[PDB]
Amino acid sequence: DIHRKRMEKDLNELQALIEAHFENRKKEEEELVSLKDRIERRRAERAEQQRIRNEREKERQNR
Amino acid sequence: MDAIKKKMQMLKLDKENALDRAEQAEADKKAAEDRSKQLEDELVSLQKKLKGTEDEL
Amino acid sequence: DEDETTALVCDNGSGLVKAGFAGDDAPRAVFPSIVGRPRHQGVMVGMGQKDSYVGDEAQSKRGILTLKYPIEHGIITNWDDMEKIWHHTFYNELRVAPEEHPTLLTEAPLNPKANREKMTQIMFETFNVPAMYVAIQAVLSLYASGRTTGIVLDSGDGVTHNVPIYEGYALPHAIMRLDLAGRDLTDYLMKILTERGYSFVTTAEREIVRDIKEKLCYVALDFENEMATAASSSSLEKSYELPDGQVITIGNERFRCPETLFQPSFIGMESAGIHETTYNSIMKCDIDIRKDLYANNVMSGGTTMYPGIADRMQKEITALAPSTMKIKIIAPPERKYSVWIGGSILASLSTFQQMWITKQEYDEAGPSIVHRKCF
Numbered sequence: 001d002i003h004r005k006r007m008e009k010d011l012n013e014l015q016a017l018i019e020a021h022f023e024n025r026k027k028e029e030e031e032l033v034s035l036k037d038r039i040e041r042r043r044a045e046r047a048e049q050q051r052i053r054n055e056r057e058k059e060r061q062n063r
Numbered sequence: 064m065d066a067i068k069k070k071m072q073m074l075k076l077d078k079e080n081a082l083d084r085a086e087q088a089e090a091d092k093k094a095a096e097d098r099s100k101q102l103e104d105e106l107v108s109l110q111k112k113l114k115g116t117e118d119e120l
Numbered sequence: 121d122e123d124e125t126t127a128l129v130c131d132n133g134s135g136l137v138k139a140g141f142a143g144d145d146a147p148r149a150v151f152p153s154i155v156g157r158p159r160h161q162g163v164m165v166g167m168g169q170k171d172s173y174v175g176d177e178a179q180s181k182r183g184i185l186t187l188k189y190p191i192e193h194g195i196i197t198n199w200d201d202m203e204k205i206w207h208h209t210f211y212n213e214l215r216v217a218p219e220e221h222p223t224l225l226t227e228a229p230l231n232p233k234a235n236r237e238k239m240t241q242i243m244f245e246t247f248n249v250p251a252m253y254v255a256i257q258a259v260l261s262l263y264a265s266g267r268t269t270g271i272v273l274d275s276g277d278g279v280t281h282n283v284p285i286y287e288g289y290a291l292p293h294a295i296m297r298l299d300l301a302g303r304d305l306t307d308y309l310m311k312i313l314t315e316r317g318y319s320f321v322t323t324a325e326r327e328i329v330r331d332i333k334e335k336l337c338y339v340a341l342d343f344e345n346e347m348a349t350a351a352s353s354s355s356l357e358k359s360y361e362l363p364d365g366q367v368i369t370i371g372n373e374r375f376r377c378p379e380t381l382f383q384p385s386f387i388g389m390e391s392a393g394i395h396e397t398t399y400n401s402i403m404k405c406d407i408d409i410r411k412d413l414y415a416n417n418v419m420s421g422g423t424t425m426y427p428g429i430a431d432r433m434q435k436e437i438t439a440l441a442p443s444t445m446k447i448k449i450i451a452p453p454e455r456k457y458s459v460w461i462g463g464s465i466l467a468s469l470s471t472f473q474q475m476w477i478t479k480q481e482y483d484e485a486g487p488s489i490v491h492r493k494c495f
């Protein structure tokens with residue numbers, strides 16, 4: 001009688017398998033969107049630092 | 064992945080389970096040919112007895 | 121804590137402690153049985169300066185602590201260590217008070233009766249558990265399998281036990297304990313790695329090499345032929361990335377380490393391999409049911425996560441025993457929790473509270489009452 005109860009709980013865990021998948025998939029999508037916005041963040045940061053280094057150079061010859 | 068581990072486990076184990084039910088059935092089949100063998104032996108011995116019966120008669 | 125007064129289920133397995141609530145599917149607080157103590161004395165201030173370190177805290181603080189085992193092969197060193205680790209488990213890890221929940225515990229097979237009497241007495245005096253029950257892990261693994269017939273191979277970290285049980289009946293006359301376990305495995309691997317050029321003594325490397333055993337180790341199908349082909353074996357040779365970053369390569373050792381349990385003559389045991397111990401165990405009992413024992417063997421323990429035990433098991437038993445009936449092993453995934461699951465199973469049914477070991481029975485007959493209350 002106890003054994004059928006185990007057969008059932010494993011079955012519960014079995015379907016739970018997909019439920020374990022869901023949190024991993026949301027975390028994957030969060031990493032997705034963070035990297036995608038990091039793309040343009042990196043590009044804009046590169047442009048900003050190029051401008052900053054330009055100001056550095058002009059102040060360099062100005063002294 | 065751990066999910067992959069479990070997947071292969073349930074699939075392979077059910078495979079072995081099905082094969083094993085196949086061979087337990089095959090064991091019952093063997094005991095069935097056994098029963099048939101004893102029944103045919105008894106039938107042949109009974110036929111011999113009947114022919115001897117008619118000869119004695 | 122649940123609103124209901126459900127019981128505590130705690131498996132103090134020889135190597136791992138797994139504790140939780142009754143009615144749960146898996147234990148909540150699971151930790152190895154290592155205990156760390158400050159390697160030096162106190163002069164600093166502002167943080168730390170705590171004696172006992174248990175659980176993941178000690179795992180993180182392995183390097184600074186002398187790592188000691190409060191239990192080894194069942195033998196008990198210091199009850200204070202169990203007192204502290206149970207305090208930690210109940211309050212810091214389970215967040216539960218034992219006052220309102222009876223405890224179901226599992227003990228290593230054939231544990232000392234004096235050990236049971238002392239541990240129960242210190243428990244009852246120190247703690248305020250309402251009721252008690254302790255059972256052998258063999259029947260717990262049986263319950264996890266849910267089949268009353270079979271021989272249980274319990275491979276803990278201190279002892280390996282072979283116990284036959286037919287139709288839910290213990291057979292102590294055919295039960296044996298073998299002193300080969302994880303400790304031996306680590307030792308043997310330590311000496312082989314010493315012969316490979318890497319010689320360590322401390323426990324951190326012990327855990328590293330048991331992790332290596334968890335990951336890479338083989339169980340050789342044929343032993344000397346596999347070292348013969350493992351002479352070069354560029355593909356068969358396997359490597360590991362140690363946390364410091366060095367790449368450590370091991371070849372035949374992967375399947376030469378677990379082999380020692382099968383071949384004890386490597387480091388000098390009179391007893392033969394554990395398959396011989398299951399074989400003798402089987403024949404000690406009446407002939408007829410032996411076939412069922414062959415077909416219903418179960419294996420349990422954390423070690424069972426390794427590959428190769430099943431194929432080796434069946435092949436050698438078929439070599440020893442006649443090959444008419446088919447021998448097949450059963451082993452559910454993640455069976456090291458299975459004992460604890462069986463504990464929950466014990467609390468599932470409503471007859472279990474008929475034989476709770478209450479406080480007043482112990483107060484009347486002392487510890488001696490357990491001699492009549494469990495068995």
Ligand SMILES: Nc1ncnc2c1ncn2[C@@H]1O[C@H](COP(=O)(O)OP(=O)(O)O)[C@@H](O)[C@H]1O
Pocket residue numbers: 132133134135136257274275276277302330334420421422423424425426456
């Ligand atoms: N995930 C795992 N994979 C492989 N081996 C493991 C794993 N977890 C634990 N072990 C091994 O199991 C041993 C502990 O055995 P344990 O399960 O405590 O025995 P028992 O069943 O008697 O409690 C440890 O020495 C460790 O090497």
Ligand SMILES: [Mg+2]
Pocket residue numbers: 133274275276277420421422
């Ligand atoms: Mg075990």
